Design a protein around this nucleic acid. Structure first.
Length: 160
RNA sequence: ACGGACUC
């Protein structure tokens, strides 16, 4: 029933302060409301990883809160550039997400109204096996795409 | 730096 595989996001360092909040208040609320364990590295592109461990539903809820917080802060500081959702996933667990001929990926794109691209295999390194899944859309469409992407990642984890 | 946090 529990899947040990966390959701891992890549977010711009600029927005981590809003995610965590003064004295941890914001992230404290998220982890309480979504019953999740969320890890942000203090030192670590000017992007930082966030690891979210929870049920599928609590994981999607925490991701959606982080996307909402980040979009608000971008508006607050007149940050005009798009902020795609970026999911990290081990190379061993992406073939099911993509599917024969990209079929599964394109279906998620059409179902969620996002544009999803995966980093090229040859950008991996010996000791970084994580591909970057970039999801372009609104807060709402990106959150739905996260739900569908991680279903496929977990399906591969739990079988493959 | 709005850096919070629950083990194995």
């Amino acid at each position: 029933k529990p899947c040990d595989l966390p959701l891992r996001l890549l977010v711009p360092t600029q927005f981590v302060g809003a995610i965590i909040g003064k004295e941890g208040a914001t992230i404290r609320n998220i982890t309480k409301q979504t019953q999740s364990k969320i890890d942000v590295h203090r030192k670590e592109a000017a992007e930082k990883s966030i690891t979210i461990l929870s049920t599928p539903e609590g994981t999607s809820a925490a991701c959606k809160s982080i996307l909402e917080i980040m979009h608000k802060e971008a508006q607050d500081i007149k940050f005009t550039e798009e902020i795609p959702l970026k999911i990290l996933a081990h190379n061993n667990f992406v073939g099911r997400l993509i599917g024969k001929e990209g079929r599964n990926l394109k279906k998620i794109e059409q179902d969620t109204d996002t544009k999803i691209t995966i980093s090229p295999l040859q950008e991996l390194t010996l000791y970084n096996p994580e591909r970057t899944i970039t999801v372009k859309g609104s807060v709402e469409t990106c959150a739905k795409a996260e739900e569908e992407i991680m279903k496929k990642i977990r399906e591969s984890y739990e079988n493959d």
